[PDB]
């Protein structure tokens, strides 16, 4: 029964570390999302194939 209480509380605790790393991952997602914004400001203008049909004809 000590084990039953242990598994109750430790199930709780592993679910809790679950939610904690879940918040870590959610904030990785959101902060890295605003960081996608930050670095996109810098890198999007070149995601393009340019100066191909300029001369070939």
């Amino acid at each position: 029964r000590q084990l039953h209480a242990r598994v109750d509380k430790v199930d709780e605790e592993r679910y809790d570390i679950e939610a904690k790393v879940t918040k870590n991952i959610t904030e990785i997602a959101d902060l890295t999302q605003k960081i996608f914004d930050l670095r996109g400001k810098f890198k999007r203008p070149t995601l393009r194939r340019v100066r191909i049909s300029a001369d070939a004809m």
Partner: protein, 187 residues
Amino acid sequence: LMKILTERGYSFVTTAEREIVRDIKEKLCYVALDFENEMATAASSSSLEKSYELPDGQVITIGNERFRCPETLFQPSFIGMESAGIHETTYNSIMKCDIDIRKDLYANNVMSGGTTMYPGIADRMQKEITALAPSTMKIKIIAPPERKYSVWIGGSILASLSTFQQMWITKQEYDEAGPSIVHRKCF
């Protein structure tokens, strides 16, 4: 310019002639930083004249008309329009915005399209707006070499952004709604 060249003795009325006057403007005209001082010498000497080749071997020589035409940008009354000019429009677009917006708009006046290639235009516009603007504030013009074409480039940039692939009217939504849909979907 067709009317001012008529004053100089060269009549341009037919399509071929109208296309030439447009071509003359593109190769010979400028706005000038200071219109009155530029006209003071352009109106007094051949040293500020330029000859244009008409496609028959004849030439037309143009003097202060070279800038009096583009000057309409600063003086629209030249064509019968009631307006104080392009620097007034720039100024009022900044002035009618909130004061915490204005500082960023004063520092970012953007030239795009044609006419932005005229000698004296980027410097003249910055001078004309700073003259209307409050002191202390920095008034600045953005005028890249991608002149007359930067808007096309902007088209290319927007059309290819990932942020824009949800902005398209599809050929489903269009077929169901008809063309009035563009008013809801684009902007």
